[PDB]
């Protein structure tokens, strides 16, 4: 579950912290909020490697472009470069990204699908929990949201996904990008799914496991003398 | 037919108090037929340990490839590669074969020589990074290892305790998988000493 919400003086994006391999939870606390540029962040759904890889590549090319032009990077640049890359690979790079940020032009919120289609919105949701999240956004969104209202709405839309979607789970990650301010990255903004104490300690008595052989491993280099 | 379950095998890594542990089985098979019980899946480049499960040809190929890359790194950098950096190198190397991948499940384990912070990480076959605090699992009995680790593990275990936990996690997971077992090795890694233990386990 990844959401983006526009507010009065900027944009906020949120995500859950679950990665899955089939029905198994591979990572209980995983970072889906990617820095393309200091004030351009995007949330990723789809193939986990593809979302990281495509944001790092464009993030790198955006940094070189920023140095070349002597200008802070723009969201439309990251957006154009992402969509042209994803379109080239005809959806075979399974990256579904919500791209947000502030630049000299103002605050921007875009979604980009794996086939290279882009759209504009005041509120967007992507991933398996998009329908749970969109339900909350469609119910509670209004024009002229404050920062505090936009964070609340964003994290509420992720929670909807966490609870009602088997694909989404664990914690809520938020990033706030306000005009004329440093983007604040709130890692584990909420922790609604903390595991309860176990009934028993499974710490074994020493010498429980049967050992065939023992040896020192040499990790050091070839020695002197 | 499925490349990642022809040869079989498992790797598991755990963090303790000022230490990490990585362990693997020793089986290599052609599906049902067991061929070798000497096929170690854990390799080390300096103080950084790499376990690899999956298609055995790719386990061997990647070992040779990372030895190559870490050797050149050391010559140019004039220092051994650190776990955090090596993790990024594995990811890079796997994703450059995105549309023709190595059928492997790599696991990085080691202690950062400068900060002294215990570090483990896992990867999917296209190089997505799973950087867990607690434990990483990989191989044909990953489901079994997830179950064992998730109940047995507690944080800040002493080296000699952590040994018992990771050992029991591997051994009991391997016995519930046809394509895993035939012996097991456990590396206990501290800042400036590493102990390697072969485990007695049922040979079927």
């Amino acid at each position: 579950t990844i959401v983006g919400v526009k507010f009065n003086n900027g944009v906020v994006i949120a995500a859950d912290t679950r990665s899955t391999q089939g029905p198994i939870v591979a990572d209980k606390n995983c970072a889906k909020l990617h820095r393309i540029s200091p004030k351009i962040w995007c949330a990723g759904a789809g193939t986990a490697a593809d979302t990281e890889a495509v944001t790092q590549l464009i993030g790198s090319n955006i940094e070189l472009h920023s140095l070349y032009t002597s200008r802070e990077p723009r969201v439309v640049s990251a957006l154009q470069m992402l969509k042209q890359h994803l379109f080239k690979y005809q959806g075979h790079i399974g990256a579904y990204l919500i791209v947000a940020g502030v630049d000299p032009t103002g605050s921007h919120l875009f979604s980009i699908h794996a086939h290279g289609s882009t759209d504009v919105g005041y509120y967007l949701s992507l991933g398996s929990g998009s329908l749970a999240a969109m339900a909350v956004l469609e119910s509670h969104w209004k024009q002229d949201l404050t920062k505090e209202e936009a964070i609340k709405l964003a994290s509420d839309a992720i929670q909807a996904g966490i609870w009602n979607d088997l694909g989404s789970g664990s914690n809520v990650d938020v990033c706030v990008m306000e005009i004329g301010k440093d983007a604040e990255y709130l890692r584990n903004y909420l922790t609604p799914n903390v595991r309860e104490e176990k009934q028993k300690s499974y710490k074994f008595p020493r010498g429980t496991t049967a050992v065939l052989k023992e040896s020192i491993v040499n990790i050091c280099d070839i020695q002197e003398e | 037919s499925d490349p990642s379950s022809i040869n079989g095998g498992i790797v598991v890594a755990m963090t303790g108090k000022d230490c990490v542990a990585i362990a693997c089985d020793l089986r290599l098979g052609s599906q049902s037929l067991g061929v070798s019980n000497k096929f170690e899946k854990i390799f080390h480049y300096g103080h950084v340990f790499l376990g690899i499960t999956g298609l055995a040809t790719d386990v061997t190929t990647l070992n040779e490839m990372f030895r190559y890359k870490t050797n050149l790194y050391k010559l140019k950098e004039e220092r051994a590669i650190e776990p955090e950096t090596f993790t990024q190198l594995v990811s890079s190397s796997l994703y450059e074969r995105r549309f023709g991948p190595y059928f492997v499940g790599p696991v990085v384990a080691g202690i950062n020589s400068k900060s002294g912070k215990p570090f483990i990480a896992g990867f999917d076959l296209i190089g997505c990074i799973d950087e867990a605090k607690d434990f990483i699992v990989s191989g044909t009995a990953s489901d079994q290892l997830f179950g064992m680790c998730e109940s047995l593990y507690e944080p800040n275990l002493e080296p000699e305790d952590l040994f018992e936990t990771i050992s029991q996690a591997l051994l009991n997971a391997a016995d519930r998988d046809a394509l895993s077992g035939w012996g097991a090795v456990v590396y206990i890694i501290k800042k400036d000493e590493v102990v390697k233990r072969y485990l007695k386990m049922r040979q079927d």
Partner: peptide
């Protein structure tokens, strides 16, 4: 592979 891994896949919100």
């Amino acid at each position: 592979x891994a896949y919100x």
